[PDB]
From Swiss-Prot, chain B:
Taxonomic lineage of the native organism: Eukaryota, Metazoa, Chordata, Craniata, Vertebrata
Coiled-coil residue windows: none
Function (record text): Non-selective calcium permeant cation channel. It is activated by innocuous (warm) temperatures and shows an increased response at noxious temperatures greater than 39 degrees Celsius. Activation exhibits an outward rectification. The channel pore can dilate to provide permeability to larger cations. May associate with TRPV1 and may modulate its activity. Is a negative regulator of hair growth and cycling: TRPV3-coupled signaling suppresses keratinocyte proliferation in hair follicles and induces apoptosis and premature hair follicle regression (catagen).
Transmembrane parts of this sequence: 1-30, 72-108
Expression tissues: Expressed in keratinocytes and hair follicles.
Residues reported to bind Na(+): 60
Protein name per Swiss-Prot or TrEMBL: Transient receptor potential cation channel subfamily V member 3
Extracellular membrane side: 31-42, 69-71
Intramembrane intervals: 43-68
């Protein structure tokens, strides 16, 4: 039993000749077995049976400059007893580390010279690491690299080892993970949002697709059923989407895997084509649908900045979304005018105003139009906006100053006009009292229509901002002194100075605060005349309320001025442009009937005789680094007709 | 002065009308078929009576429409105070939107136009 | 190094990794793992936590004469430890002492709102009813108990702190006065009421307003709001 | 800073049952005096990969034993 433990720390410290002695003494203990299973005898001596850790893993946790001598001796001993393949590919039977091999930990400690020895040993390069260290609580003890030694080499900046592991022919790339990930799902889920964090994931995801792999890499679905790029969309990874979605390949033999297409080259001016297969909303689960309809992403405004996304939203604005907007504005605008035209009441006089709205059995063909006209849209919104509540489970009002909260507030207005007439047929006395609440909320609904005017649309965002993030700061302090100084006035007005008995009619403490409410508005009451006990003290109390309010308004400004010269001028545009993008796709899902007027550019040539390949998009570039050009498709043409 | 009127006031005015015409509805129904008192002297209208008395809140009247009231007339001022604070935010956002990196632009943009 | 407010020399003395064999026992950081990018590390924490007398985190908070004190609590084996004691002890002990003080200031005000709305003279600031009103039996005792409790509590903070009273005027240890003023005057109300020197309410209302002015101290803990109350 | 003055006043308020402080359980220092001093965990990240001979335990996780 001491032989197993003495041989560990000799290796972990790196005792050279002491290792050779206990090796030779183990050879004496080899022949102690009569000729029986010398393989299975050494599996208990060279490996602790508790964790399954061999003697070679403890050799590879620690490292000193003896280790290169240590490894070549201990592997030669594994050669001389013919157990090498079971030995070099041994793992941990422990549940925490089911799959940690010696090749895995060698790449972690970044020893490429030892790495070539273990490949010369013929270790299993296709090993998996399905241990507990996934950890769905990712912010500790995780590092989900995707279980494979290649991606572990790919993740932790070991490109020479990646170049080494690629050249071995028994090295899979097409392997999958417990989450269904390939290797090139795994690089996406590591690449953090630090701009050029000596950035390499953009460089090494380059270095795998360009080394090998045809189009049978990026169509593989995981357990979620996603591409690399669909996974690149949902996780909000910014900069790795920029490489995957531009990707010019200025070579001959493998530019079929590219993503950009330079069409012309006429010196400075140059028309270029972007690929657009799984990007436009034309299939299920398109990546532009993923970006808009998602929470959990802070740099989403940088996601829609990239050119084969930004121009496509601007295209669908100019042909579909702008025209479908102002009609649904004006139809909602007439809906809110005509409902108000009940309360303006052009006849100005009848018996009782005996209805919220009703059709006239005798005359008033104009009133025959309008009372039907409000009732139809009232049904139309409830049919429409009940579905948006019915679909969206997680994203309701988490971002309070976002959308999918006005879908509630549209729905409240459409119910109450129906609930008006539903009350009017049963006559529960609350005819108007439900109606007027609907009529005011209809005008409050009009803030949602304040988009599309880029001057105005920036202004409406901060009105939602100040009310729900700064007013409630101000209001809870303003109540706190209101309820403070009102006490010192109510005791004056009740059991003290004033005059003979007064006409209160609601209360006494409430009388003071109501007369102190109006100081923000103006009354200048004769409570100063309804006074004694030096009534100058009343105004010296009352003036010290006003100045104390005036500071509370000033601090609200300055706290809203917290580096506001750059933030809220960018923060509003960050919300507003996104809030436009949610409107557009709702219209793009509204009529899936005749999409003859989308943009496709007519599936131009890819590489091979499969010219009519995929539907594209044109952008145009400019000066600054002239060069020669062999990359194009067509012999410097123009808007060719043929 | 030419800048603010034709590029920022019309932003502010179209939102200011939008709540003016909003909260005036909730006051006009109070003043017509509800609480107030016995019959009043309107002389122009009823919905227009509310908005005209709600116009002056930006100016000052402090009318006896609070006395021309019932149905817990504290609710009238709690309606009316929530108009004033709602206006006060609309003036604040107009400032901050005009403060959009304004420390360098409009001090240069005016000189750009004026010269 | 704590008391003199020396910033950067505290950063070396309190991280201090020693990547050697023979003398890393004098180190102050301890790297526990190394798994490529992710790495869990251990910080030493002997004379730092409040577990002995004169701990260095006690020195930093309770001190004047330091301008870069906000940079002192920025360092990681201090900042995370305050955030730890917030999440397990300080947050829960705060909102109860908020709500207990909040009911203390509502119930005192409920004398002046005066739900009966009419009696002979309002003949008392607060008094227990010998006949009825079990609800009034609760509240009048309830104000008087905390009134004793604050004076026992906040008299000690005046009794301890000699130098740092209101030197930084916009700092704490000045509200410990203003809590104490309110607790005296409610006692001084009834102490006046038994001797009948005509100033029953006139001392009471000054206590009742200052109780609401005391509520600014409770405006911490909401990081949005707590920045606003300082200015 | 004004938060930090509140917290220690509560930490001095009930010195009665401080069973629920943080200590991490006096992990190994260097020598056979393993149970040495009570500690605190923080976690670090990318940017300058290197080899490592500095650690204490054989790349474990939330170890149970």
């Amino acid at each position: 039993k001491r032989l197993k433990k003495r041989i560990f720390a000799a290796v972990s410290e790196g005792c050279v000749e002491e290792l050779r002695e206990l090796l030779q003494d183990l050879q004496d203990l080899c022949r102690r077995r009569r000729g029986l299973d010398v393989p299975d005898f050494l599996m208990h001596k060279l490996t602790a049976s508790d964790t399954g850790k061999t003697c070679l893993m403890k050799a590879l946790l620690n490292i000193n400059p003896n280790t290169k001598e240590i490894v070549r001796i201990l592997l030669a001993f594994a050669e001389e007893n013919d157990i090498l393949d079971r030995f070099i590919n041994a793992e941990y039977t422990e549940e925490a580390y089911e799959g940690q091999t010696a090749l895995n930990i060698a790449i972690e400690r970044r020893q490429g010279d030892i790495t070539a020895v273990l490949i010369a040993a013929g270790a299993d390069v296709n090993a998996h690491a399905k241990g507990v260290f996934f950890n769905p609580k990712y912010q500790h003890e995780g590092f989900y690299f995707g279980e494979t030694p290649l991606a572990l080499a790919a993740c932790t900046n070991q490109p020479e080892i990646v170049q080494l592991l690629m050249e071995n022919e028994q090295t899979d790339i097409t392997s999958q993970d417990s989450r269904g990930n390939n290797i090139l799902h795994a690089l996406v889920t590591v690449a953090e949002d630090f701009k050029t964090q000596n950035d390499f994931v953009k460089r090494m995801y380059d270095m795998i697709l360009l080394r090998s792999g045809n189009w049978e890499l990026e169509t593989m679905r995981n357990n979620d059923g996603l591409t690399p790029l669909q996974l690149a969309a949902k996780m909000g990874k910014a900069e790795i989407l920029k490489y995957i979605l531009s990707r010019e390949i200025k070579e001959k033999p493998l530019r079929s895997l590219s993503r950009k297409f330079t069409d012309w080259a006429y010196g400075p001016v140059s028309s270029s084509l972007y690929d657009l297969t799984n990007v436009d909303t034309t299939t299920d689960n398109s990546v532009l649908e993923i970006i808009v309809y998602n929470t959990n992403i802070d740099n989403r405004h940088e996601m829609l900045t990239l050119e084969p996304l930004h121009t496509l939203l601007h295209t669908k604005w100019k042909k579909f979304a702008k025209y479908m907007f102002f009609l649904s504005f004006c139809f909602y605008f007439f809906y809110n005018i005509t409902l108000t035209l009940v309360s303006y009441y052009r006849p100005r006089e009848d018996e009782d105003l005996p209805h919220p709205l009703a059709l006239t059995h005798k005359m008033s063909w104009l009133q025959l139009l309008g009372r039907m006209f409000v009732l139809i849209w009232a049904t139309c919104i409830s049919v429409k906006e009940g579905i948006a509540i019915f679909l969206l489970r997680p994203s309701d009002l988490q971002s309070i100053l976002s959308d999918a909260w006005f879908h509630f507030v549209f729905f409240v207005q459409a119910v109450l006009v129906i609930l008006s007439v539903f009350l009017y047929l049963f006559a529960y006395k609350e005819y108007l009292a439900c109606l007027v609440l609907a009529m005011a909320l209809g005008w409050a609904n009009m803030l949602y229509y304040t988009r599309g005017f880029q001057s105005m649309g920036m202004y409406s965002v901060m009105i939602q901002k100040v009310i729900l993030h700064d007013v409630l700061k101000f209001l809870f302090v303003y109540i706190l002194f209101l309820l403070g100084f009102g006490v010192a006035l109510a005791s004056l007005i009740e059991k003290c100075s004033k005059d003979k008995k007064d006409c209160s009619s609601y209360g006494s403490f409430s009388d003071a605060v109501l007369e102190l409410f109006k100081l923000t508005i103006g009354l200048g009451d004769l409570n100063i005349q309804q006074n004694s006990t030096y009534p100058i003290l009343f105004l010296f109390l009352l003036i010290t309320y006003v100045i104390l309010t005036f500071v509370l308004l000033l601090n609200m400004l300055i706290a809203l001025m917290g580096e506001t010269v750059e933030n809220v001028s960018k923060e509003s545009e960050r919300i507003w442009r996104l809030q436009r993008a949610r409107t557009i796709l709702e219209f793009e899902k509204m009529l899936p009937e005749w999409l003859r007027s989308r943009f496709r550019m007519g599936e131009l040539c890819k590489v091979a005789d499969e010219d009519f390949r995929l539907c594209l998009r044109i952008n145009e570039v400019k000066w600054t680094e002239w060069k020669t050009h062999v990359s194009f498709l067509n012999e410097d043409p123009g808007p060719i007709r043929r």
